[PDB]
Design a protein around this motif. Structure first.
Motif, short mmCIF file in Angstrom:
data_model
loop_
_atom_site.label_atom_id
_atom_site.label_comp_id
_atom_site.label_asym_id
_atom_site.label_seq_id
_atom_site.Cartn_x
_atom_site.Cartn_y
_atom_site.Cartn_z
N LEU A 105 0.85 -1.23 0.00
CA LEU A 105 0.00 0.00 0.00
C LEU A 105 0.87 1.26 0.00
O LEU A 105 2.04 1.18 0.42
CB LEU A 105 -0.91 -0.02 1.23
CG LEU A 105 -2.00 -1.08 1.21
CD1 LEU A 105 -2.73 -1.14 2.54
CD2 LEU A 105 -2.98 -0.83 0.06
N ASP B 258 1.55 5.40 1.20
CA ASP B 258 1.67 6.08 2.52
C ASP B 258 0.35 6.79 2.88
O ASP B 258 0.13 7.02 4.09
CB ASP B 258 2.85 7.06 2.54
CG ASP B 258 3.30 7.47 3.93
OD1 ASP B 258 3.71 6.57 4.69
OD2 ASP B 258 3.24 8.67 4.24
N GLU B 259 -0.47 7.14 1.89
CA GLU B 259 -1.81 7.77 2.08
C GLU B 259 -2.78 6.72 2.64
O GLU B 259 -3.45 7.02 3.66
CB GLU B 259 -2.32 8.37 0.76
CG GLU B 259 -3.02 9.70 0.94
CD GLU B 259 -4.26 9.66 1.82
OE1 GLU B 259 -5.22 8.96 1.44
OE2 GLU B 259 -4.25 10.30 2.89
N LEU C 22 -2.08 4.04 4.26
CA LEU C 22 -1.63 3.82 5.66
C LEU C 22 -2.25 4.90 6.57
O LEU C 22 -2.65 4.56 7.70
CB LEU C 22 -0.10 3.87 5.74
CG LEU C 22 0.63 2.75 5.00
CD1 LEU C 22 2.14 2.93 5.09
CD2 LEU C 22 0.24 1.38 5.53
N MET C 23 -2.34 6.14 6.08
CA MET C 23 -2.94 7.29 6.80
C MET C 23 -4.47 7.18 6.80
O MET C 23 -5.10 7.83 7.65
CB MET C 23 -2.51 8.62 6.17
CG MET C 23 -2.08 9.67 7.19
SD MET C 23 -1.30 11.11 6.41
CE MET C 23 0.27 10.43 5.91
N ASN D 35 -3.72 6.12 13.22
CA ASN D 35 -3.43 5.83 11.79
C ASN D 35 -2.34 4.75 11.72
O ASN D 35 -1.38 4.85 12.51
CB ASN D 35 -3.03 7.08 11.00
CG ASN D 35 -4.16 8.06 10.80
OD1 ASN D 35 -5.29 7.83 11.23
ND2 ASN D 35 -3.87 9.17 10.13
N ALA D 36 -2.49 3.77 10.82
CA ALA D 36 -1.54 2.65 10.59
C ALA D 36 -0.14 3.20 10.29
O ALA D 36 0.86 2.59 10.76
CB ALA D 36 -2.04 1.75 9.49
N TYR D 37 -0.07 4.30 9.53
CA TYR D 37 1.17 5.09 9.27
C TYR D 37 1.81 5.49 10.61
O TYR D 37 3.05 5.37 10.73
CB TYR D 37 0.90 6.33 8.42
CG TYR D 37 2.06 7.28 8.34
CD1 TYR D 37 3.27 6.88 7.79
CD2 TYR D 37 1.98 8.56 8.86
CE1 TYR D 37 4.36 7.74 7.73
CE2 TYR D 37 3.05 9.43 8.80
CZ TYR D 37 4.25 9.02 8.24
OH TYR D 37 5.32 9.87 8.19
N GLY E 272 3.45 -1.71 5.80
CA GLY E 272 1.97 -1.76 5.76
C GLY E 272 1.48 -2.44 4.49
O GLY E 272 1.55 -1.80 3.42
#
Lengths: 23, 715, 715, 19
Positions: free
Chosen positions: A6, A8-9, A11-12, B47-49, B64
């Protein structure tokens, strides 16, 4: 790894869960 | 390595617990409040990040991965974090430990450890995998300390009281065991030979013994109350003081009730430490002395009494878990009902308007039925526990009387000796009952102690800074920003690269589209937060080098959503600055036009106000805010018209105040309406966290930028 | 005539209680909820005019007199209503009964009856006298009914269960009294003659008796739980349903928590009636049977046991009042602390900004110290009660053993008979203890019963109206107002004489200065309230003659402060109207531009919304409100931009919707900003609850009225 | 009576359970 990676967005975009309690 | 699960102390922190759990599993115990601070757990969620960043910061090599329905592939090292959905209601984070042939082991931080069937879990989970592995930088350690021993410190000054309670309890027990031999002396000696004078003397003797016993109980009861209150006060006040010293980041992260739950937590931890200190001191000896006395009386009856205690111990320990599970399940179902009732009551206008009076009732009934079902199940478990304890206690009593009479008939012990033994059971069973009924209290106490102590270990605001205040005494000068990026938690940055220039003693206006970024840019200038990328220069000196005390004392911030604390208007007006003369307050009060509504008050300056100025209108309220601001006599005055009505009766009074300033002090206005700011010197346009164009109104309109389009959209 | 005092069930109702108290004193008992409705008790408080009007309505000849420091003057009617000040904090109403030489008798509805020294009271009171007197029209009566007997109705269907519980309890007692004679048979017969075979048989016999006893206890415990829950559910649901059927007036008068406090006390009502019914049934016989058995055993020891019960009764009854006084005083001091902590936490931005971290802590510490002091005083009273009960119980036990042994030595009773008597005390004292420990529960229960029943006796919304719906089926037509005066309670009228004219299928705008009067004029048109003076005509038919169901179903009201109940978006969008096809919902959804953010929700349409749409953006929430409104397909669409930001991204979507209406249905917009309404047909200006000038924008600007000045003040 | 009279406004000004 060997899984669909995935950005980085995305993930956010994933968010964690609250729960109900006494107040 | 056995499976480890970290419990949720708060509601929002789900992912923080999962990362902490895996961190513990690999052998790195870290404070959960610190990991909460690392992951950036906002009031919304994690957030997973944020989790990946926090992991990468700990030295875990992690990525992720979008969940694949085929998760049966061998080379996907566990433990891994996968976000499930709790009964199609809210997103939730859960820790996968071992995916077996069809059963998946998931150590749910919400509720212990659970194992789901492949097809079931696969239906529940969104599927969002976070795969972690230690990559050299990771190091095994133990960074959390035992807070239960830290909170034992408050028992050091109260040594005398503890020792006095211990002696009182010991002497109470001794007079108790001495007093319990009355029935023996009655049945064996006095009644047999029919002595009257001796009976009359012994009766009074035991009566006086009991009167001294209840007097020691009374004295102990007073001292244990005083000790309890003293430690409770100490812990509560120690916690409260620490919270206030923490930075705004801490208060943005958590809710209100989330912080005050800690006070109730503090009330519960105190109880446990007090109980542990006393019980162990006065019962572990009392039980032993009792047991010795019984073992001396008769062996068979003592070993029967031991079995009674053993069986009671087993029944309580086996029933301890399900009761707590049912209890939690009731509190959940009750919290939903009361939430539903409030929601239903708040918008009765709507329900009435739509004629949905039937549906809401049917909905409420179903939620009451759910609570009744949960209540009944817990009731049933309590009845079952009560009944089985009933059986043991009663059969224990009967079988001891049976065995006793048998031993008396055989001529092993005398008659009265059995009744004396029956009396001493009161002083043998009670201690060990009280000792066995302590394990649930201790467990919930250690939880509370950790929950509270984790917050007490957080770095205070003052400690995070190093300054050079003697180098720059004054603030007054040109305010500028250099490359100032800002992000609240670990989410999208609110402000990107910014460049500003605020010259001394000019009414500069910051207008924009996003109210959040606008109000953030003010809150940043006061140095509540600190920008990651860039810096802020006042008078050619970095804010990080200036005193926190002077910065906050020399800058006034007037928000439209003003807060008023319940007190006297006069005291409320000059909060934080004592030894202030009324003669100033009345001069300041005029500038806001306080007087006009202040005179209509019962007391000019000493009038009491309702919680959050309930009796005060918005227009008057803000004037109390401006009066508070102008009393400060600041070098920077930061106004806000954000989330406002702008009735246009207050604007005149704001202009009256801004003219009344009468100094070379900077005024920064943040008003979304362009009609108010046209008169200002330099209008800065905040667009998507970027200053696009800057300068005077006429120049900005003449240049025909984004401002022109917005101004033409206005009128 | 003895002094009568009415207690405050809610917090705000002070004057209502005083008028009810005097009304009772003269001999007219009226429901306090009805007097609350008469006086017009708003969430703020009660106006003395409201009390005088309410008195004058009951037929009491009364006048409001400005307090005179010289109130020792004879010829002023007693009692009178004087408003005092509670420790210079809030305004309070209190009832004066007799002003003696220097002592003033004041039956404070907040706290029972109290007597103050002339100089003290004279310092406390503002001084605002209301003198009342019956003037022929007043008539003595009893209009309240006993609600405790009304709530006994729910025990009628559960006759079988009550009778089954009664038999189970009776048979438990019988096996208890039968099982308590074991020690007698042990000491007198078996141990004397040293019989083994008989001992082994009797031991098992009493063991089996006990096993049947605990089984009946288990069965009773299940039935009493089921009965309790059943009545609790019944009362709670009966109350909830009645509240929803009440008019908006009821919900404007009271707060949220004020309504749910009834839900929390529905438990204690049921708990009291249920407990009291069963206790009287199973204990008044159990105590008698026990007492008879003891009186049969030995007279002297029974009369000693009677004295023990008598003394316990006296100690509890004398200590009952101060404990409740201390308890109330703790709950007050605790409520202030928790309020102060919330207030301190909500505005930490301010405290930090002013550097007042020391003062707030010192303030909090003083409030904790106050709570500790109050806690300690209540603790001390409990210790004193516990100790004295301890003394009585213990000395009772010793003196009974003394007297017993004396009576045995004299050869009045046998040895084992004394132990059997000591065993039977368990079945004699427990019932009468439980019977004496019921009076506080009953008293607080009757309070709760009245508190709840008063609300259940209020006239529902449907019953207050008579209609003629078959005469006018459709709404569509010219809407007009005639002389429409309106006042919320008994205060200044919000709207004076008004004349309007809204022609069918035209976008008419109502602009003004006061948001309250503007939103009130919408809420009036739906017939939530009813204007005292004037009337409202739709299509040449009075609204009072049209069906409530049709009126509310045919009119959509879109407020900016929209409410969203926690559920599925799809279900939430069509609340109140079931059997609605998705194909409509999706067509309506488009008109609001729901889709654009609906598609980005995790689940398309079955997204579980957070409490009051917390996760959803304010802009998003509005679009749902419009989607809800357009689904209704109404004849009148009433918009609101009151207490709004007006970001100007929603205005386009409102215009998209208003164009999308596509019918001959009336649209009434209430936007304070003049920039939005310029395109409208007829702009009505609300000034100080009066329509000054009406017509088109161009005509209103051309006439150069108040509108011209406001428009020139805009730009 | 024999006391200082009040206006219907000042009757509306007196409050109970308010500040």
């Amino acid at each position: 790894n060997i899984g669909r990676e995935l950005t980085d967005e995305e993930l956010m975009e994933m968010t964690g869960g609250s729960t109900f309690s006494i107040q | 390595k056995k499976y480890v699960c970290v419990r949720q102390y708060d509601l929002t922190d789900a992912g923080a617990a999962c990362l902490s759990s895996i961190a513990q599993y690999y052998g790195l115990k870290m404070s959960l409040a610190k990991i909460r601070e690392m992951t950036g757990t906002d009031t919304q969620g994690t957030n997973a990040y944020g989790l990946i960043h926090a992991a990468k910061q700990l030295g875990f090599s992690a990525k992720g991965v979008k969940a694949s329905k085929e998760d049966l592939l061998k080379d996907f090292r566990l433990p891994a974090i996968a976000n499930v959905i709790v009964d199609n209601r809210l997103a939730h984070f859960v820790v996968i430990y071992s995916i077996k042939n069809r059963i998946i082991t998931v150590a749910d931080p919400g509720k212990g450890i659970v194992r789901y069937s492949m097809d079931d879990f696969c239906s529940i989970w969104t599927g969002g995998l976070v795969l972690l592995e230690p990559g050299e930088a990771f190091q095994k350690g133990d960074y959390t300390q035992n807070m239960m021993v830290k909170f034992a410190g408050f028992l050091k000054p109260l040594k005398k009281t503890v020792l006095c309670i211990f002696l009182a309890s010991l002497l109470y027990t001794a007079l108790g065991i001495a007093g319990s031999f009355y029935i023996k002396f009655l049945f064996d000696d006095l009644i047999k030979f029919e002595k009257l004078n001796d009976l009359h003397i012994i009766s009074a003797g035991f009566a006086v013994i009991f009167l001294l016993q209840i007097f020691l109980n009374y004295y102990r009861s007073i001292l244990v109350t005083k000790l309890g209150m003293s430690i409770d006060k100490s812990i509560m006040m120690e916690y409260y003081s620490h919270v206030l010293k923490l930075p705004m980041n801490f208060f943005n992260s958590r809710k209100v009730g989330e912080i005050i739950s800690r006070f109730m937590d503090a009330s519960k931890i105190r109880q446990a430490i007090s109980g542990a200190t006393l019980t162990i001191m006065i019962d572990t000896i009392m039980a032993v002395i009792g047991g010795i006395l019984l073992y001396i009386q008769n062996s068979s009856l003592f070993f029967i009494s031991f079995i009674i205690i053993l069986l009671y111990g087993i029944i309580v320990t086996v029933f301890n878990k399900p009761i707590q599970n049912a209890n939690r399940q009731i509190m959940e179902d009750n919290a939903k009902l009361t939430s539903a009732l409030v929601e239903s009551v708040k918008g009765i206008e709507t329900i009435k308007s739509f004629g949905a009076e039937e549906q809401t009732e049917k909905s409420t009934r179903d939620k009451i039925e759910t609570v009744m079902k949960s209540s009944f199940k817990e009731g049933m478990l309590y009845i079952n526990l009560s009944s089985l304890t009933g059986i043991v206690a009663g059969l224990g009593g009967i079988v001891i009387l049976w065995a006793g009479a048998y031993n008396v008939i055989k001529g092993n012990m005398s008659g009265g000796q059995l009744l004396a033994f029956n009396a001493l059971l009161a002083y043998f069973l009670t201690p060990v009952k009280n000792l066995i009924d302590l394990q649930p209290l201790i467990q919930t106490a250690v939880v509370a102690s950790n929950r509270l102590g984790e917050i007490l270990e957080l770095a205070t605001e003052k400690e995070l800074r190093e300054d050079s205040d003697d180098f720059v005494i004054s603030l007054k000068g040109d305010i500028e920003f250099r490359n100032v990026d800002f992000r609240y938690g670990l989410r999208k940055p609110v402000l990107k690269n910014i460049n500003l220039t605020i010259p001394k003693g000019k009414t500069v206006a910051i207008v924009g589209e996003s109210g959040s970024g606008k109000t953030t840019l003010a809150k940043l200038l006061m140095n509540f937060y600190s920008p990651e990328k860039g810096d802020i220069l006042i008078n050619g000196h970095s804010i990080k080098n200036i005193s926190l005390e002077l910065i906050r004392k020399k800058i006034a911030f007037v928000s439209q959503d003003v807060f008023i604390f319940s007190g006297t208007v006069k005291e409320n007006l000059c909060l934080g600055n004592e030894n202030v003369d009324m003669d100033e307050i009345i001069k300041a009060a005029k500038m806001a036009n306080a007087h006009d509504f202040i005179e209509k008050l019962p007391l000019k300056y000493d009038t009491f106000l309702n919680e959050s100025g309930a009796n005060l209108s918005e227009g008057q309220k803000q004037r109390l805010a401006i009066a508070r601001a102008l009393l400060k006599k600041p070098d920077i005055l930061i106004l806000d018209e954000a989330t406002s009505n702008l009735d246009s009766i207050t604007e005149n009074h704001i202009k009256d105040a801004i003219y009344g300033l009468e100094d070379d002090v900077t005024v920064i206005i943040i008003a979304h309406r362009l009609s108010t700011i046209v008169n200002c010197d330099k209008i800065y346009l905040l667009k998507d966290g970027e200053i696009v164009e800057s300068g005077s109104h006429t120049e900005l309109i003449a240049l025909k930028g984004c401002y022109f389009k917005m101004w033409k959209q206005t009128e």
